[PDB]
């Protein structure tokens, strides 16, 4: 902005909800130099000031050059780090990595003006390459000064729906550029009209995101209308927001919310008959259309007295001091009313006591006893209030009720999705698609790849005895990595001695591992360094990255498949090497033995997944199934007993059978009910 | 059991395929019948069978009457 236009003081007021109570904010009571949207004019340096800095800066340059030269040294990067950003050729130029090839570029400035002719796009900066000169301005600071000068983020978001999606804090989230969605819809085949229709949506996400302040009295004036079945008003047609709001409320969602809440409350007091001595409580019948009818209202929940109840002056959920001596009466009700608010009125409380005092003292509103509590809710902001008559054991209950509820109802939570689609905000987890059973076949593609296990790295194992109890030891652990193609393992054993002098071994472990991976890749010539390194435990995303930074090519996935690579340690030869380890070391193996020469990597990996997936289950009772033929040799070379192919047909038939049997036993779904899919998922997860 | 077998025979490949069936199999007899129909006696590289086919195609395309009506 270059212009003088300032912040109407009414727009700096905001709100927040504490469990203790609503807290409010206005910074506008205190009158100061009133608030101006900072404008470009201050963020730019007059050309003079620069050029002058060009003389001097270049001077101290050439001098200090002759200084390091006077040492036969070259200018340390250090000095000029005093000031980079100043001078017309600037500085970072001199430190550009590529300068040796730019000296061979000449006459750029004549070109860059001529680019006018060769091609179309306007080139509003034609007087510099940023390679030669560097960068001639920073509008960074501007960003901040606009935010702050608008009163800090929160005071903005109060202008949004963002409370509606009810993320607690925004700090984990990413947007979705619309341009992506739009383009991703352009590669299809679209009529020119269809094409224009992709102009809109990147608005339509906007006017939602701003709908509270766009939609309000002070703005469109005009006359209200309601959306069809719901409780929202439109000061003007706003043809976008209408449609998108509809798609936020369908299946008559408004109601289903209402009912869901009320229903949950009676499910509360229902349990509470005892505590308060309430002779009963009823969900009333409701004119089905009540939830959104505004002018008039009826009660909802009915409440009874073993003897009677001492009412109070009607008060607010967060208020403390009570007068029960005020009255004594019998039987109570509740209303649940929803309003979907604006930035104009986002504060419910006043909305409550307006509706309480009104409807209570109203003629047409029908509340069987003039005793009962108003519970309203802001859908828009997730706010809630109740201004009721009061008993012992209500507020201490009810507060705890609502709290739990806002975290709970399927309904509300089906706003907080269905909206946060419309806005397309997402929580950030990881974009990287995991291996799933669908994804699975890709493993055998031609990428060099690894699996990595932290499970057995730290092992203190327990056994039962005669006297004290629980024989328990720290054990040399295994860091179990493999490449399913060549079947080379890597075991980094971590010896107990390293563990001793540290605490809180959880994190430190994972870090030990992450290093073992980084260096372990560094034991590989890049020809043999892999691409997808497939993590098991999610938490290993972070620690690998930091140590895998220098290897940008190498993508890291976790999976959803629980992979039985720890049960390998059950193997004799393995636990031999590992249990005997006196020091942390690296030990290679081929788990495939040679199944390769016999049959392809795929199967070879499959049957392996069988042996393991069972060795988490039948374990030794499976180990007999391996050992049921003594005639058959296990070399020092190999691990698995060699066989014929047929013999494996038989084995894998058995092994296959087990995991089913024991599975459908533990989980008591008979084997016979399972789809081929389902079975193999069970083999995998 | 009609429209099926109809389209089935009405399909051009089959419809030819019967017309192949009846014609003799020799170099000499067929090749004769070729040159009688005026066509080139031999096409550059073809083993006998393909020559027979080559007739059948010529018969269908032109919609000639049968080889007896040829003669």
């Amino acid at each position: 902005s270059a212009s003088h236009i300032l912040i109407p003081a009414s727009d700096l007021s905001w709100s927040k909800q504490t469990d203790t109570g609503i807290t409010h904010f206005r910074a506008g009571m205190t009158h100061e130099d009133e608030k101006l949207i900072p404008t470009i004019f201050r963020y730019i340096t007059t050309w003079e000031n620069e050029f002058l800095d060009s003389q001097r800066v270049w001077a101290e340059y050439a001098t200090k050059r002759q200084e390091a030269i006077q040492q036969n040294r070259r200018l340390a990067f250090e000095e000029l780090e005093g000031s980079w950003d100043r001078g017309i050729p600037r500085i970072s130029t001199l430190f550009q990595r590529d300068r040796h090839t730019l000296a061979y570029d000449r006459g750029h400035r004549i070109r860059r003006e001529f680019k006018q002719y060769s091609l179309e796009r306007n080139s509003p900066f034609w007087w510099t390459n940023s390679h030669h000169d560097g960068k001639l301005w920073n509008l960074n600071a501007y960003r901040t000064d606009v935010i702050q000068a608008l009163g800090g983020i929160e005071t903005i978001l109060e202008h949004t729906l963002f409370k509606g999606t009810g993320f607690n804090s925004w700090e984990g989230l990413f947007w979705e550029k619309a341009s992506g969605f739009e383009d991703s819809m352009q590669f299809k085949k679209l009529t020119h009209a269809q094409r224009t229709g992709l102009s809109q949506i990147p608005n339509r996400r906007f006017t939602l995101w701003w709908s509270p302040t766009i939609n309000r009295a002070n703005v469109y004036v005009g006359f209200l209308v309601q959306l069809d079945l719901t409780g929202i008003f439109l000061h003007g047609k706003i043809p976008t927001l209408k449609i998108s709001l509809i798609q936020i409320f369908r299946a008559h969602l408004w109601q289903k919310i209402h009912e869901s809440i009320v229903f949950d409350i009676c499910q509360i007091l229902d349990g509470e008959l005892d505590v308060l001595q309430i002779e009963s409580v009823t969900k009333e019948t409701v004119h089905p259309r009540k939830s959104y009818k505004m002018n008039s209202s009826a009660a909802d929940i009915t409440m009874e007295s073993v003897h009677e109840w001492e009412v109070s002056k009607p008060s607010l959920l967060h208020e403390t001091n009570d007068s029960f001596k005020g009255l004594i009466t019998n039987k109570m009700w509740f209303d649940v009313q929803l309003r979907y608010g604006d930035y104009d009125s986002h504060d419910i409380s006043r909305y409550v006591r307006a509706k309480f005092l009104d409807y209570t003292t109203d003629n047409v509103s029908m509340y069987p006893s003039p005793t009962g509590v108003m519970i309203g809710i802001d859908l828009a902001y997730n706010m809630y209030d109740a201004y009721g008559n009061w008993f012992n054991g209500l507020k201490p209950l009810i507060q705890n009720s609502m709290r739990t509820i806002m975290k709970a109802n399927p309904a509300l939570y089906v706003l907080r999705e269905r909206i946060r689609k419309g806005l397309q905000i997402y929580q950030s987890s990881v974009q990287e698609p995991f291996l799933n059973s669908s994804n699975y076949a890709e493993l055998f593609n031609n990428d060099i790849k690894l699996f990595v296990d932290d499970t057995n790295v730290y092992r203190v194992t327990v056994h039962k005895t005669f006297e004290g109890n629980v024989a328990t030891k720290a054990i040399n652990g295994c860091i179990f990595t493999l490449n399913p193609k060549t079947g080379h393992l890597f075991l980094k054993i971590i010896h107990t001695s390293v563990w001793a002098g540290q605490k809180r071994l959880s994190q430190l472990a994972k870090w030990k591992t992450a290093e073992e991976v980084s260096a372990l890749v560094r034991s590989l010539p890049k020809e043999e360094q892999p691409k997808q390194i497939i993590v098991t435990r999610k938490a290993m995303l972070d620690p690998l990255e930091v140590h895998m930074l220098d290897f940008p090519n190498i993508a890291i996935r976790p999976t959803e498949l629980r992979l039985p690579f720890s049960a390998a340690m059950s193997i004799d030869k393995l636990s031999d090497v590992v249990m005997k380890a006196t020091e942390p070391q690296m030990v290679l193996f081929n788990i495939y033995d040679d199944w390769l020469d016999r049959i392809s990597s795929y199967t070879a990996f499959s049957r392996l997944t069988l042996l393991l997936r069972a060795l988490k289950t039948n374990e030794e009772s499976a180990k007999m199934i391996l050992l049921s033929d003594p005639t058959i040799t296990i070399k020092s070379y190999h691990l698995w007993p060699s066989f014929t192919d047929e013999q494996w047909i038989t084995i894998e038939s058995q092994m296959r059978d087990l995991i089913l049997t024991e599975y459908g036993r533990k989980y008591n779904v008979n084997i016979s009910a399972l789809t081929q899919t389902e079975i193999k998922d069970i083999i995998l997860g | 059991n009609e429209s099926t077998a109809d389209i089935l025979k009405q399909l051009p490949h089959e419809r030819l395929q019967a017309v192949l069936e009846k014609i003799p199999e020799e170099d000499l007899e067929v090749r004769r019948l070729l040159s009688i129909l005026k066509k080139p006696e031999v096409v550059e590289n073809e083993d006998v069978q393909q020559r027979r086919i080559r007739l059948a195609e010529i018969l269908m395309v032109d919609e000639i009457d049968l080889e007896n009506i040829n003669n």
Partner: protein, 75 residues
């Protein structure tokens, strides 16, 4: 140093910065996946029963909340 249980125990998965200063646990590898797959299974059979037999769940606030709800050794 905190335990959950010739049995071996391994460190349970925990995030570095989310864990920060917190009590660390020792679980059995087979028992973790065991319990998790029992619970998740109980959810699946209830899915097939609900969607197949077309029954509507009671649930709501306290039930879903309780669903959100879902020994030291010296060595």
């Amino acid at each position: 140093s905190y335990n959950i249980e010739d049995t071996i125990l391994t460190l349970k998965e925990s995030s570095i910065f989310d864990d920060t200063d917190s009590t660390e646990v020792l679980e059995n590898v087979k028992a973790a996946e065991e319990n998790a797959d029992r619970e998740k299974l109980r959810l699946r059979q209830m899915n097939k029963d609900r969607r197949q037999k077309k029954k509507i769940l009671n649930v709501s606030s306290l039930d879903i909340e309780e669903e959100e709800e879902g020994h030291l050794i010296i060595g």
